[PDB]
Symmetry: C3
Subunit: 96 residues, 3 copies
């Protein structure tokens, strides 16, 4: 099941069975999508900006402290977080 997490400091990018990889790290807190699909971004900023490509998809400040949600992402798509977050591929139907 394709997953990744970055990471809690001093953890960096970690990765679970990427074969073929669905995801590829870019810098810190940032990866790139290699494979179209429905993904679940999760993460935490406790006991901040989530970005898909150039614009913001979540802005944690606020009744819960969980980052992310479910999103269709496509090849070359980036996610950046501007304490961890990770991603899991749920499905790749037809059609995305």
């Amino acid at each position: 099941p394709c997953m990744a997490k970055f990471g809690p400091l001093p953890s960096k990018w970690q990765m679970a069975s990427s074969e073929p990889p669905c995801v590829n790290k870019v810098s810190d807190w940032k990866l790139e999508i290699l494979q179209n699909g429905l993904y679940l971004i999760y993460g935490q900023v406790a006991p901040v900006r989530l970005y898909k490509n150039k614009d913001m998809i979540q802005t944690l400040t606020s009744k819960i402290q969980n980052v992310g949600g479910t999103y269709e992402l496509h090849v070359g798509d980036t996610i950046d977080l501007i304490t961890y977050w990770g991603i899991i591929l749920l499905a790749n139907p037809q059609f995305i």
Copy 2:
């Protein structure tokens, strides 16, 4: 794994026994009890389950959450006015026998 998506225009109902059955634009019926994840995006108003409002949107926002749904339920995304990087979809996550 059973899922369906509507839009973005001019795409319609895209579908992947079925767990869901389209009704018309933006609207589907649930054919299977289960735990479902509804997702999507509204690029600028409300999500319904059997005529009751479950989310209301007012920037591009996220549609959905996780919902147990039963045979017969419908899911609709309604706009005040027509006047579209807008889509929504559903994936079936599980069907434990305790969802009925």
Copy 3:
């Protein structure tokens, strides 16, 4: 077969379990569960507030992970989803806690949990 999951309520249902072999969760008490298995879990649910509640204690409904509040609900006028996706470890508990027991309608309130993955990375 699977995913491993559990649900509490709505009343009269208590803890119900599916795909418990081998178990990922242990019931601890009403509305409260223990994690048996490290994992990526998705927590979901419905809180139905008593919109006519008006006793002494202030209104608030909370989801906890151990001693940390992870979701707080103070609007008594609408039925609200609870949960999220979390990395969870053996001995973590998740509990859903009402400031007083008539702040919620328990015949329409529940929460459950599903195991999405164990990456062989968390802890």
